[PDB]
Amino acid sequence: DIVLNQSPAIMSASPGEKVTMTCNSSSSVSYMHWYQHKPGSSPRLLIYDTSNLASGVPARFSGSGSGTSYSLTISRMEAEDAATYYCQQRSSYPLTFGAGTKLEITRADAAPTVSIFPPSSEQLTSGGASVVCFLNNFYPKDINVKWKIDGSERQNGVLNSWTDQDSKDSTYSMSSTLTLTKDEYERHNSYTCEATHKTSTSPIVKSFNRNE
């Protein structure tokens, strides 16, 4: 299985901007296909045999390459070009794919709206306790969440998940869940979700007191 290395793994561009991504091969290949894949639909053949556009594909897309290095270029990015792009070699069996370059849309930096939620009575009744923090509609994607209980950071038992880039406003959102035992939960008062981001000099702090 020939290994194909796509770079960058993820990138962002403003509409109108020129975009280039690369597919480098551990071995020589004679041709390369490219596919476009958007959430909500299945892969679409974009270029075949290195540089030929598939049916329906706009001339802003072009492909080039030879030997061990191949590339895909959009002369002028449209918003509808946000997608994951995969290269595929066709010179050795099995046919193999790169891991994808996710092409995102650049928008203006946006600070997160942060909300923190205590465990439900339903969950406490069953012996567990999860504290949830939502960090909604921010840009860029990189963000850090810190959980503090009674002033001391907790790093274990935290599950985080990011949404895909929003189709309407191009922001991201992220959810963080810290799960505790009910007994440890009932032994502490102060629960804090702390967010750091390009848009804050100090952390955004949301908190609740179990005694209130």
Binding site: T84, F117, Q123, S130, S161
Partner: protein, 220 residues
Amino acid sequence: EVKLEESGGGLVKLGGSLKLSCAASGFTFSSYYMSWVRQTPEKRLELVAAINSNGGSTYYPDTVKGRFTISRDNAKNTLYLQMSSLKSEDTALYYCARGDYYGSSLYYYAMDYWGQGTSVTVSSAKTTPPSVYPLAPGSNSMVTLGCLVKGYFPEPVTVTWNSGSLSSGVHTFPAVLQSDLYTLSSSVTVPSSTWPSETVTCNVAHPASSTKVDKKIVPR
């Protein structure tokens, strides 16, 4: 109008078997090479099987050779994948995809149309219904509420708000797997004038256990 429509996906235990079908329309099925390609959870794409115009030749990568059998009935315009001796790493979305025209005179080994896919999970973990917990603030012109859908298996679940009436301002986050159970959350943001004065309800479904839960978000 080319159309490829897969079926047969499901949950199977390690070493089990599944049979996938793909219904093809909009073209002369018997005139094309056909393939199965899978999207893994980490979003890698892997060819798993290919077959020529008749059922005569077939190709499998070593990773599935001897385990998977691709076939086709050109009478029924139908492609099949028999998947056996299944392994954890066969978990994926399986696409049916069309290859070369038989008499192209120049084979490209490109997949020019793909189905929407059918989902397969290979695991021995026990199917478990979710617990659905309301997320209400402890104590802005808007308020953000949530539902935590915890401890279920397998994927997927669906979440709506007010039976789909609240669509804008919703974020349903991708589930996270930990120790054979998934946790998923969903947030909804609404005018503070609408809650708690009116009801906000999350509607959760988990087909794999036939569970459906409607959880109102109660203040305090």
